[PDB]
Design a protein around this nucleic acid. Sequence first.
RNA 1: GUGAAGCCAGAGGAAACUCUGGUGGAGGCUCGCAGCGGUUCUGACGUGCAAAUCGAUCGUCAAAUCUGAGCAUGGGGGCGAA
RNA 2: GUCCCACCCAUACCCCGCCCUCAGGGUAGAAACGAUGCCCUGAGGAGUAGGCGGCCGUGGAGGUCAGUGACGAAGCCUAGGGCGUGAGCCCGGGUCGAACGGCCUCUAGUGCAGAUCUUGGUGGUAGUAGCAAAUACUUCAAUGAGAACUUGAAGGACCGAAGUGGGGAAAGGUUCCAUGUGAACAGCGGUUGGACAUGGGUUAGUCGAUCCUAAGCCAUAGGGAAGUUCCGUUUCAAAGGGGCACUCGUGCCCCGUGUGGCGAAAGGGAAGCCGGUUAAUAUUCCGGCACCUGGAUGUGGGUUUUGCGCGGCAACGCAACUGAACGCGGAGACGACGGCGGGGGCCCCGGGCAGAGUUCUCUUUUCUUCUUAACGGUCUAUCACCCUGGAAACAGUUUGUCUGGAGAUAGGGUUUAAUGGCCGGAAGAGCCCGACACUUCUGUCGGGUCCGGUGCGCUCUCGACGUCCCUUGAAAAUCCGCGGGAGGGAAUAAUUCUCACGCCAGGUCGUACUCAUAACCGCAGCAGGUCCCCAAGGUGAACAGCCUCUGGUUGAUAGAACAAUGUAGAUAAGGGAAGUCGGCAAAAUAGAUCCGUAACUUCGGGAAAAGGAUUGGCUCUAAGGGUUGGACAACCAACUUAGAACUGGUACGGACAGGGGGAAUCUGACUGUCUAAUUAAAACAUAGCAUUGCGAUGGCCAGAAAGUGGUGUUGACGCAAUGUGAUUUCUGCCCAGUGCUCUGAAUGUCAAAGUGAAGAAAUUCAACCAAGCGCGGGUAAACGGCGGGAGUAACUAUGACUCUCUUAAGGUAGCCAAAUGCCUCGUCAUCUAAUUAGUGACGCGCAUGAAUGGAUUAACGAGAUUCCCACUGUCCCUAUCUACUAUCUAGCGAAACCACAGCCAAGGGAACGGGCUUGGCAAAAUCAGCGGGGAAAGAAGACCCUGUUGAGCUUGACUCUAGUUUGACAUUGUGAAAAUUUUUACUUAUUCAAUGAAGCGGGGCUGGACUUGCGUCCAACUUCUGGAGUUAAGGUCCUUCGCGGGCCGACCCGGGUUGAAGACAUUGUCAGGUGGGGAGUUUGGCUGGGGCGGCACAUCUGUUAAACCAUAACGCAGGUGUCCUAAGGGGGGCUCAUGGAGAACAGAAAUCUCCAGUAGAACAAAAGGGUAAAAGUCCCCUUGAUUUUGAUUUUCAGUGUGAAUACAAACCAUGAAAGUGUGGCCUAUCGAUCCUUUAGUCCCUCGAAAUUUGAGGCUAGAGGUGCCAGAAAAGUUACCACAGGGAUAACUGGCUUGUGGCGGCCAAGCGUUCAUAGCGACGUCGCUUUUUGAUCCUUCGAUGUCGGCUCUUCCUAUCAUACCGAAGCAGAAUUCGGUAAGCGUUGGAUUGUUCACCCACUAAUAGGGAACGUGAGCUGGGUUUAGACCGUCGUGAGACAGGUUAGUUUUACCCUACUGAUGAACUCGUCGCAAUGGUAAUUCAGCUUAGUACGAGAGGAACCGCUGAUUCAGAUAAUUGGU
Length: 252
Amino acid sequence: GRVIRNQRKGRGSVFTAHTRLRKAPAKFRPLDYAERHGYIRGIVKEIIHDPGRGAPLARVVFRSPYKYKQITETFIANEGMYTGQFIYAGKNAALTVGNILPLSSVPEGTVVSNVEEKPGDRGALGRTSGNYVTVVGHNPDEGKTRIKLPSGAKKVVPSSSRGMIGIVAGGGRTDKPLLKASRAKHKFAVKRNRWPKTRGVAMNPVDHPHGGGNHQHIGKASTISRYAAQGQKAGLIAARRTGLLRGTQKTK
RNA sequence: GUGAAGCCAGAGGAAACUCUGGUGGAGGCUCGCAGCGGUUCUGACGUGCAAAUCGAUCGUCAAAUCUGAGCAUGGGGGCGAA
RNA sequence: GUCCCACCCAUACCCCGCCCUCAGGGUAGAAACGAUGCCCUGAGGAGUAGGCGGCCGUGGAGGUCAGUGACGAAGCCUAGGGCGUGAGCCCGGGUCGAACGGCCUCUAGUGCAGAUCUUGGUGGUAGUAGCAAAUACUUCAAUGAGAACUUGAAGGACCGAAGUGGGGAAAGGUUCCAUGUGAACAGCGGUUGGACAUGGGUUAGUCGAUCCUAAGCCAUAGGGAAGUUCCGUUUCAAAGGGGCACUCGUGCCCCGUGUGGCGAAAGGGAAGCCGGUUAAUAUUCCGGCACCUGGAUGUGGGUUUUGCGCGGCAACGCAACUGAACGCGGAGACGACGGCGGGGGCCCCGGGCAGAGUUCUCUUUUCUUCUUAACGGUCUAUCACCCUGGAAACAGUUUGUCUGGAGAUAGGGUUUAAUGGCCGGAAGAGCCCGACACUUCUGUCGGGUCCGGUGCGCUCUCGACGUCCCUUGAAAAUCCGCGGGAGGGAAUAAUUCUCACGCCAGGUCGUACUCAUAACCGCAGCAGGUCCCCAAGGUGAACAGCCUCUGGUUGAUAGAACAAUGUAGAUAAGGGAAGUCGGCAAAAUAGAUCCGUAACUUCGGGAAAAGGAUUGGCUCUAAGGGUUGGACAACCAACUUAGAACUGGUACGGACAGGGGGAAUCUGACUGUCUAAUUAAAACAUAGCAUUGCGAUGGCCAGAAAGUGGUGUUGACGCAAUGUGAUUUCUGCCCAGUGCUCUGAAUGUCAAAGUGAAGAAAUUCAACCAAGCGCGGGUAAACGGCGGGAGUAACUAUGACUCUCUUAAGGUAGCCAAAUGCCUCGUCAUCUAAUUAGUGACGCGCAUGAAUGGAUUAACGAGAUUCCCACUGUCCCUAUCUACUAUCUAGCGAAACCACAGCCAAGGGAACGGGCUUGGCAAAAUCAGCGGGGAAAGAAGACCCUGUUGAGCUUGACUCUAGUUUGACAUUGUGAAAAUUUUUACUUAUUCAAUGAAGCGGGGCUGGACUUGCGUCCAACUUCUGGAGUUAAGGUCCUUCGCGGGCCGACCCGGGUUGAAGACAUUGUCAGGUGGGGAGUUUGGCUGGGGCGGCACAUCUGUUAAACCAUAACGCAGGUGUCCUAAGGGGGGCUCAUGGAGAACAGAAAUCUCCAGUAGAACAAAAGGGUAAAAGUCCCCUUGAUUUUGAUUUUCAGUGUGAAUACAAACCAUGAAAGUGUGGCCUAUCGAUCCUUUAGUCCCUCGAAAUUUGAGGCUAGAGGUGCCAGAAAAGUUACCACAGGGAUAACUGGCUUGUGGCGGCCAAGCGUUCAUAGCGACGUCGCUUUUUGAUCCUUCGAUGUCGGCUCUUCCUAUCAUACCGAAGCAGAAUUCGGUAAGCGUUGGAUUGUUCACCCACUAAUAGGGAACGUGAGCUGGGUUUAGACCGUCGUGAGACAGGUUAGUUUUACCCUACUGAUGAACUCGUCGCAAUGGUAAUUCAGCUUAGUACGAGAGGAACCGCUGAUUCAGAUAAUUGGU
Ligand SMILES: [Mg+2]
Ligand SMILES: [Mg+2]
Ligand SMILES: [Mg+2]
Ligand SMILES: [Mg+2]
Ligand SMILES: [Mg+2]
Ligand SMILES: [Mg+2]
Ligand SMILES: [Mg+2]
Ligand SMILES: [Mg+2]
Ligand SMILES: [Mg+2]
Ligand SMILES: [Mg+2]
Ligand SMILES: [Mg+2]
Ligand SMILES: [Mg+2]
Ligand SMILES: [Mg+2]
Ligand SMILES: [Mg+2]
Ligand SMILES: [Mg+2]
Ligand SMILES: [Mg+2]
Ligand SMILES: [Mg+2]
Ligand SMILES: [Mg+2]
Ligand SMILES: [Mg+2]
Ligand SMILES: [Mg+2]
Ligand SMILES: [Mg+2]
Ligand SMILES: [Mg+2]
Ligand SMILES: [Mg+2]
Ligand SMILES: [Mg+2]
Ligand SMILES: [Mg+2]
Ligand SMILES: [Mg+2]
Ligand SMILES: [Mg+2]
Ligand SMILES: [Mg+2]
Ligand SMILES: [Mg+2]
Ligand SMILES: [Mg+2]
Ligand SMILES: [Mg+2]
Ligand SMILES: [Mg+2]
Ligand SMILES: [Mg+2]
Ligand SMILES: [Mg+2]
Ligand SMILES: [Mg+2]
Ligand SMILES: [Mg+2]
Ligand SMILES: [Mg+2]
Ligand SMILES: [Mg+2]
Ligand SMILES: [Mg+2]
Ligand SMILES: [Mg+2]
Ligand SMILES: [Mg+2]
Ligand SMILES: [Mg+2]
Ligand SMILES: [Mg+2]
Ligand SMILES: [Mg+2]
Ligand SMILES: [Mg+2]
Ligand SMILES: [Mg+2]
Ligand SMILES: [Mg+2]
Ligand SMILES: [Mg+2]
Ligand SMILES: [Mg+2]
Ligand SMILES: [Mg+2]
Ligand SMILES: [Mg+2]
Ligand SMILES: [Mg+2]
Ligand SMILES: [Mg+2]
Ligand SMILES: [Mg+2]
Ligand SMILES: [Mg+2]
Ligand SMILES: [Mg+2]
Ligand SMILES: [Mg+2]
Ligand SMILES: [Mg+2]
Ligand SMILES: [Mg+2]
Ligand SMILES: [Mg+2]
Ligand SMILES: [Mg+2]
Ligand SMILES: [Mg+2]
Ligand SMILES: [Mg+2]
Ligand SMILES: [Mg+2]
Ligand SMILES: [Mg+2]
Ligand SMILES: [Mg+2]
Ligand SMILES: [Mg+2]
Ligand SMILES: [Mg+2]
Ligand SMILES: [Mg+2]
Ligand SMILES: [Mg+2]
Ligand SMILES: [Mg+2]
Ligand SMILES: [Mg+2]
Ligand SMILES: [Mg+2]
Ligand SMILES: [Mg+2]
Ligand SMILES: [Mg+2]
Ligand SMILES: [Mg+2]
Ligand SMILES: [Mg+2]
Ligand SMILES: [Mg+2]
Ligand SMILES: [Mg+2]
Ligand SMILES: [Mg+2]
Ligand SMILES: [Mg+2]
Ligand SMILES: [Mg+2]
Ligand SMILES: [Mg+2]
Ligand SMILES: [Mg+2]
Ligand SMILES: [Mg+2]
Ligand SMILES: [Mg+2]
Ligand SMILES: [Mg+2]
Ligand SMILES: [Mg+2]
Ligand SMILES: [Mg+2]
Ligand SMILES: [Mg+2]
Ligand SMILES: [Mg+2]
Ligand SMILES: [Mg+2]
Ligand SMILES: [Mg+2]
Ligand SMILES: [Mg+2]
Ligand SMILES: [Mg+2]
Ligand SMILES: [Mg+2]
Ligand SMILES: [Mg+2]
Ligand SMILES: [Mg+2]
Ligand SMILES: [Mg+2]
Ligand SMILES: [Mg+2]
Ligand SMILES: [Mg+2]
Ligand SMILES: [Mg+2]
Ligand SMILES: [Mg+2]
Ligand SMILES: [Mg+2]
Ligand SMILES: [Mg+2]
Ligand SMILES: [Mg+2]
Ligand SMILES: [Mg+2]
Ligand SMILES: [Mg+2]
Ligand SMILES: [Mg+2]
Ligand SMILES: [Mg+2]
Ligand SMILES: [Mg+2]
Ligand SMILES: [Mg+2]
Ligand SMILES: [Mg+2]
Ligand SMILES: [Mg+2]
Ligand SMILES: [Mg+2]
Ligand SMILES: [Mg+2]
Ligand SMILES: [Mg+2]
Ligand SMILES: [Mg+2]
Ligand SMILES: [Mg+2]
Ligand SMILES: [Mg+2]
Ligand SMILES: [Mg+2]
Ligand SMILES: [Mg+2]
Ligand SMILES: [Mg+2]
Ligand SMILES: [Mg+2]
Ligand SMILES: [Mg+2]
Ligand SMILES: [Mg+2]
Ligand SMILES: [Mg+2]
Ligand SMILES: [Mg+2]
Ligand SMILES: [Mg+2]
Ligand SMILES: [Mg+2]
């Protein structure tokens, strides 16, 4: 048989993400002395649209504590942020929307965005439009913080991890139907070469495990073991259950 | 060609929102020329003009439209709206 | 039919000659002899495969012939000889020119008709096919040997601004220009040429490259890799650039986070325009007039002298008008589309000027020219911004919008923005006229070169608005501004000047030409393909079609004629789909304006639904604008609309251009995409829906590895993997099976490592185990599944209901003879005259059914289907016209194919002959057609089978494997605690993350707030504002007294950059599991083709089997893979099955008695033999079913194996013995090598020598190969491949004729009566090859496989027609039969049909053959490769003799045959004859006979005669119609 499309995707080549129109990655400031001990003030210059990203980004200018230059950063814009707004990043920053604070100096029950998995990593969690991370609780003796992720998972991160107060802008982007093949094409044409998608059962046996046959049918259980070989993992990988979800799920 | 929002005016009514002239210029809308394609004649030709062309008739024609150059993917590999 | 006589001839027989072979003899005191010779005698002679012998020929070697030869070697040619059976040898003649041969040995690349053989050459075909797309040529002249395709002039035409025009990019490379030209090429010619030959031609600071970066590529540091090299592109790197100072280069002082290259002739980007000029270059040359960049220093100007301009309220202005580091900003720099406004150019209109055209007539006419570059100066030009002021009675305002107390209207200003006006350039140019010189050298000189208008016009550009996006639409080099304020700046002298003028320089490569019906790629001068720019007039909505201007061509082999058949363009009376699988093809409709427009609907559509009317020309009228005066008048300007009269051909979108429509069904929602070159679809995609995994120490994936990579400039509204497939309404039940997921205990299973025991040790044995699995839960929008039987309602049918068997559950809602149902052309209704079609219903549905999605569905569809209107040559039924061919000619000129060839009939034959046999026959040489034959040409059949030949794909095939999971060992160190194992502590190994490696850890100074034995905790100064923040101010001492030098300002200390994980993870090596993701391989045989079946595959009995033996078939009836401690061995006593008599229960049968009883019983098992004091049966004793090795028999090769037979060595059993016993009374009951396991002994070996373990040998058994002389082995292919096979299937033919069809003989019986008018049982004899079987003879290096259409001929077993005979024949109508194939045998609905059945006509609507006639005749509806859907089946790939949809139909010019047409020879003609060949007519109706014969009556013929008509044939065009 052939190498299947899912296997080919990992080679790169035509499946590499598009990057020309992306200006800079969305990252916090590097964790420095000012952010560790007090706060630093930055000015929002513009709210820009980043192709391939649903959420808008905010360009924020800060002063260098050690040089005469000025530094422009690219944050994920939280909804409610505006051009000409002062934002504050640090331990002693006020608890207002757009401020970047360590989770230790944040009370329980507030939502943040671009939460660092570890301090200094400049943001990893809850960075997509309409998404946020909730600060469930604190453990000061352990120096840790329990948070709730957009997926519903519970995580524990060091209290020094930073986050931006508020909710990622971009609202309910997925609330309107795409309604058109062209609109799906435009959505993915700035992300990746993954659209359109041909069904495996419409292929031939040389091309996919779902293969051919005189009727379009999978012919064997579509749930595939977690430890199946590469080239076998087509369908529902390591599926605990299948079928329509007809009630609440114990797992979360 | 059709004529979506938005806008102007006038008629009713009590209200609220009904109606009627206009304006406007949206749509993977439509007729249709070039381009692109290739349905039927199962036409021509079938030691051809041609190792796939020719004619008529057809599909689409403002956007999943057509196309140049540069560049990338190399054989059990690639690429594939398959 | 029989008998007799003579005769004819085979390669046979007889006699003779000769050849050869074989056989038998003779031949030496050698006068003897290729002694391998000779002489004598007898017999014999076929031959594929094959064997042997002898000889001939070729290249080369040794010896020899004292060989041949320029007075002619070799070779070659030869209707000239000789020899040999023959292969061959020799000679004569000719040609020719330098070597060669005989004999004996030696040697080999040694002998050709084949191999779809190799290379080369050459034929018939054949002067043949053909040289026919792109509208088209003609006259005169010149040139020349020669002119349709050279040139000039004239005419006629085309391209018709998305050109046949003018220039470019790629690509070519000299094709560009001049001159000359024999051949070759330009498929005709050629004087011509992109050809050939000889010479020329490409000029840049300004146009490009060069410079920049993009996607991307390659280095570097490092890390992998055995390595070629891979990653890496800033990453675990000590990676650079700025200034000052001496006689002299070298003395220092500051900044630093960066620290490569390549990559665009369309992206970014410094700068050039006009006129002229050459044969060919020009934005490059020449003339004039400019610009940019860089470098230098001047003159003037400006500014200042303790300093770096002035003005304006302001927006800002002015000719400058200092400014380091460091920083900020702008430009470069960006999407698509819409309407509006400005500008350039083009187009158009009016007037004037100059020229030209027309001018019978008319036309103040028609056409052309009338131009102004870069670069500058100057004045303007929307948006915006500034000042005054303060708006509701809101106002301003666009086509649209919008704007305003965050300050509108208004008034006044500032400013970005020329492709605008004027001026310089610049009229001196260019152009246009006009007039005077002249072999040329020289032209010369005059004049003129203007003014207005218009616009939904075209094109480009600019501007302000606006729309769309889950889409927001490059980078860098370079240039500029500013914030900052470092340095520096002569009251009589320079002046860190972006001002004016001035000086110097600008290298290198490209530059011709074409860019295409001839310069590129398609083998080529190819109707194909190949990226752009400019873009006139008319009609018209219009870069539509059609015509024209500029410009370009007139180039595609020509002449003549007008047959068939064609290709292309059309027209047809009447009918109007009757054609056909099917309306294929064609026709019909078509623009605009005005009316009118249904069902349904997602309310958007449907819709141009359906349909109807009008349209020309001319003469008028009205309306729709701008400007000025004074509510009218005047002036200016286009078009768009409406109304009226008149008028003609009742015509007018007059050409061109240009929708047919409707009622429904299946299906996919739609737009979109694909099998380039047979499938455009219902397939794919899609939005929507649903499921699954993943929180980064991660999911999925790539890599040999990596300090590797993609997703990822990413973080659940995300990434990845699947299914279904818009909307609407729904999506039922089943977790038993296979998967996936979760737990691994009360539970079982296990490897390596480790633990314990035994041992001398190797080892062996025990426990223990991680993963995985057994186990137990979950899960179907996972793969998938979703049942049988029996009764039941006052007649009855059915079964609401019930009784019963089983599953994991038993098909729910829906839907249906549907693209899914076989039976089936289902049943009913409708549609038609007629419907296997369509639609609507019905449903025990072979085999419908719910995201393997069910049902419905507006809109959409080059999808499939039915009907209706319109329309028509599809047809009845054909006809006609045009162009180009074909045709004939000149020139040029192939190919396929070809054993030899070409008339038939029958026969036989390899079962379909051109050749053979027997007949018919049979006359040169030819031309146009033609599609019967050549089982015509393609192409070593693709269907089928075989091969111990493959390949693609699948899986629970066999064997493995990347990856992965888990365990162990190592990396791997240091502590503590718990009674060796577990837990948690350390950081330095190791791993991760961040950063420009800035503020980490301890303190102590201060600020605080909390507390009473004054003690502890916290903190380090930024949060009103879209400003700024840098090159330190100061304190303190030193000082050269300086924005100078140190310590503070800015606390000290540890040099751990910071934060995490941490001896875990990672990594290396082994071990268990998982692993169609991947690899390799396999997937029996026989066989009335193969498959399925069966086993005729090892083996036994009887028979087939034809009396020894032997002997076949998928022949017949059967049997075997066991069973027995006795059912083996010995001995003895007895006699069985059965019958007749008898005896209580007792009988048909229980036991007892007697008599008969040849085996009719029994002997393990099939069958056949055999057995009676036994071989049966019972009793007694036993283990001969033992040890050893030979011999023999059957199957047979006289090999194994299995069986079997007689005897020897022994020592046993039994009988008093004799004797018997080496398994089963006989004929079947079974198994090699290798390996393993036993048994056997003072047995042999472990090879330096010993002992003990262990191992290996020798002899005899066992573990098994049943495909049984003995491989370890699953499918599929419709995507398929190869070597073959007519050894072997599907279609023709051949034999046969069961079966099918058609007859005969007999005649029980039927027929009221009567077997035989006519039927006809039981039986029996046949014929036919239009059925289907059976066979496998021909064809698998191919004979084109159904049907229909068309066309001819043949048969008779006669449907009709002619003439006859019989009846249960009064007439009429029928029935049966005879002679009879002359002549006919139809039009339609449904179906691909064949077949069939209906409607209807008819005299009748008979049956058949001709390779199941007929595909180089058609067509392609059926069968039907590859695409696709459904149902059932399969785990799957896939299958289906099931349904459905789409799917390339090639070649004739040869020979013959046929149809026609010429024709030599016999002088040429005219008029004739007639051998032979062909042959043609057919049926019905009406009137009369006649309401008559005959009949009770109903009813109801016929002969003759008359008049028409059907089908067919041969002509013809007066008339009518078509063209
Ligand atoms: Mg592969
Ligand atoms: Mg798909
Ligand atoms: Mg497919
Ligand atoms: Mg597969
Ligand atoms: Mg699978
Ligand atoms: Mg499907
Ligand atoms: Mg469209
Ligand atoms: Mg085309
Ligand atoms: Mg064709
Ligand atoms: Mg036509
Ligand atoms: Mg012989
Ligand atoms: Mg030789
Ligand atoms: Mg000679
Ligand atoms: Mg010589
Ligand atoms: Mg040879
Ligand atoms: Mg030869
Ligand atoms: Mg031969
Ligand atoms: Mg010819
Ligand atoms: Mg031709
Ligand atoms: Mg011609
Ligand atoms: Mg032509
Ligand atoms: Mg002459
Ligand atoms: Mg010509
Ligand atoms: Mg023309
Ligand atoms: Mg154009
Ligand atoms: Mg040209
Ligand atoms: Mg051109
Ligand atoms: Mg190129
Ligand atoms: Mg010449
Ligand atoms: Mg020629
Ligand atoms: Mg010539
Ligand atoms: Mg010539
Ligand atoms: Mg000449
Ligand atoms: Mg340039
Ligand atoms: Mg350069
Ligand atoms: Mg590299
Ligand atoms: Mg290295
Ligand atoms: Mg470069
Ligand atoms: Mg450029
Ligand atoms: Mg010059
Ligand atoms: Mg001065
Ligand atoms: Mg650009
Ligand atoms: Mg015009
Ligand atoms: Mg001028
Ligand atoms: Mg001037
Ligand atoms: Mg003048
Ligand atoms: Mg072309
Ligand atoms: Mg026009
Ligand atoms: Mg017009
Ligand atoms: Mg030309
Ligand atoms: Mg030609
Ligand atoms: Mg007609
Ligand atoms: Mg007519
Ligand atoms: Mg009609
Ligand atoms: Mg048609
Ligand atoms: Mg038509
Ligand atoms: Mg409507
Ligand atoms: Mg309709
Ligand atoms: Mg209409
Ligand atoms: Mg049309
Ligand atoms: Mg579709
Ligand atoms: Mg595509
Ligand atoms: Mg195709
Ligand atoms: Mg193909
Ligand atoms: Mg699913
Ligand atoms: Mg299950
Ligand atoms: Mg279960
Ligand atoms: Mg376990
Ligand atoms: Mg049901
Ligand atoms: Mg349906
Ligand atoms: Mg049904
Ligand atoms: Mg039906
Ligand atoms: Mg029907
Ligand atoms: Mg079913
Ligand atoms: Mg089903
Ligand atoms: Mg379901
Ligand atoms: Mg519909
Ligand atoms: Mg011909
Ligand atoms: Mg000729
Ligand atoms: Mg010959
Ligand atoms: Mg014959
Ligand atoms: Mg014959
Ligand atoms: Mg022959
Ligand atoms: Mg002849
Ligand atoms: Mg022909
Ligand atoms: Mg023929
Ligand atoms: Mg032949
Ligand atoms: Mg073959
Ligand atoms: Mg074999
Ligand atoms: Mg194979
Ligand atoms: Mg293959
Ligand atoms: Mg104090
Ligand atoms: Mg730690
Ligand atoms: Mg470890
Ligand atoms: Mg596998
Ligand atoms: Mg495999
Ligand atoms: Mg076989
Ligand atoms: Mg079988
Ligand atoms: Mg015998
Ligand atoms: Mg048998
Ligand atoms: Mg016995
Ligand atoms: Mg015994
Ligand atoms: Mg006895
Ligand atoms: Mg004894
Ligand atoms: Mg054995
Ligand atoms: Mg063995
Ligand atoms: Mg030894
Ligand atoms: Mg064995
Ligand atoms: Mg055998
Ligand atoms: Mg045969
Ligand atoms: Mg018969
Ligand atoms: Mg009879
Ligand atoms: Mg037969
Ligand atoms: Mg046969
Ligand atoms: Mg064959
Ligand atoms: Mg043949
Ligand atoms: Mg043939
Ligand atoms: Mg027919
Ligand atoms: Mg007869
Ligand atoms: Mg008769
Ligand atoms: Mg006849
Ligand atoms: Mg026949
Ligand atoms: Mg036939
Ligand atoms: Mg034929
Ligand atoms: Mg054919
Ligand atoms: Mg046929
Ligand atoms: Mg089928
Ligand atoms: Mg079909
Ligand atoms: Mg088709
Ligand atoms: Mg009478």
